[model samples]
Target: MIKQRTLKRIVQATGVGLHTGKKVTLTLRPAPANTGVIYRRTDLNPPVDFPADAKSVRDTMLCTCLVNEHDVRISTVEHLNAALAGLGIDNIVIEVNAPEIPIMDGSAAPFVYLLLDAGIDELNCAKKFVRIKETVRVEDGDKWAEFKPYNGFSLDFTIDFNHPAIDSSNQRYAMNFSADAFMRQISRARTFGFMRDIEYLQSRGLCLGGSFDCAIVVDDYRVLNEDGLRFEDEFVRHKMLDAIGDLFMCGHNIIGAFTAYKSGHALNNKLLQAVLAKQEAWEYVTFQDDAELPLAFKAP
Candidate 1:
């Protein structure tokens, strides 16, 4: 049966927040079906809850940031969100002791492992998906993102960086999405940075905790990390990873084909907003038959 899912038990991890550069603790707890994904600021005297969705996005400078009506904010949600999408997690309460999610290795792999450790528990309710009926697209100058009707979830992403180090790596990737496929192909791909931008951001008091341990940093002609890269095409793979998370900000799994060219968090959010506004373009659905469910969601 197609059922909503959550964690079987509570789990926690401690790591450094990318913005604050402070050690922070994060907790994962099961939520009821329909609760969606909620981020709780536990350190506040009166905890604040910010539900994840396209409308809650406040900024996307270097990361996806969420904000509530009160203007309270949480940063760096994309990687964890990707992990949830990858595992088909439907409802969960994310408790963070800081304003940002921990930046463990700057990849979804760590979050995926944590969710696995907590164990996936199916809920009594059926799972829901946003099924595309007509194409929805968003753009920012030369960059663009689109969601088109498809039988299953898949992504095609392309990135262009003229630096010698980046130019040497593959710049485009396309793949059908599945839990096992996500873990193997996208989860380990870390976010990357250019040395010039890192320095500039740090100078502007941004990306304070970015380092080789958490990101692949490239200099003019080579990777600054002594260990090289985890994959020859890690850059574009990471972009796809980010797009998965960005699309999941819709607060449910999507049944559609995603295509992007140099798109980032902003365009992804815009695409979701556009898709949602045009009710005729998509519909909420659930599969009653396992055979009818998209292969991207059927448990492997």
Candidate 2:
């Protein structure tokens, strides 16, 4: 039987936030079993624990943000959260010295490698999960997100960007998360942006650290990066990456099918809130055996 897990020793890493363009340092430390992964902003006057929950979401413009009562918030948390969720990590405390989590090459790959280097150790407590029992949906304009009953956690993501450079031919991806496919197929797909928005974001004092090395840049009809895409369907693969991170706000691993159409962080966070608001839609479950754990947790 397997149980909740956390790092055996404290691990530290540093990088730049995608929007803030500020250098940030993050430290991961062990926590008691079942405590769930939580974030603490050390830069604040008094450190605050931002429980990884849908209700903690305070902003979601270009990234996910988690806030506390005093309005202490941390943005761009999806990549870090996705790494933890993909690994089936349950209890840990993350301390960040910035207003946002570092973009880390615009994908979850770096964070996954960092965690692997730090190493994970199982605790005595059983892992917890939210098992979907009924359908829950959230929508805004043309974007939509939904969760339905499923035997295991899975994601189906579709992104529609009406840009010729994005190659809309293949913009959908599905993963059961019962295998190591997330790391192999999705973790390296970097975040992307348009050329026009670069100057606009810079004007507002944002995205100052973004570069061709970290993001897939697109012009109206072509990708500005010389290397092109890492994967033919990288656009949609990154969408799945964001969805995995946003879902982690539920504070527990999810056992259900997540369906998203043209959804971003805002819509994804809303879908989680909708599911939480309706208690009839979900229930908590625990897993004890390594074989019984989600496929994503097993070594490739």
Give me candidate 2's TM-score against the actual structure: 0.91
Candidate 1 local lDDT, residue 280: 100
Q: What is candidate 2's local distance difference test score?
A: 0.84
- lDDT for 109 in candidate 2 is 94
Off by over 4 Å in 2: 289-300
For each candidate, the alpha-carbon lDDT, in order, equals 0.90, 0.84
Q: Residue 273 in model 2: shift from native, Å?
A: 1.4
| Candidate of highest lDDT | 1
For each candidate, what TM-score against the reference? 0.93, 0.91
Please give the lDDT score at residue 173 for candidate 2: 83
- After TM-score superposition, the amount by which residue 190's alpha carbon in candidate 1 deviates from its true location, in angstroms, is 0.6
**lDDT score of residue 299 within candidate 1:** 68
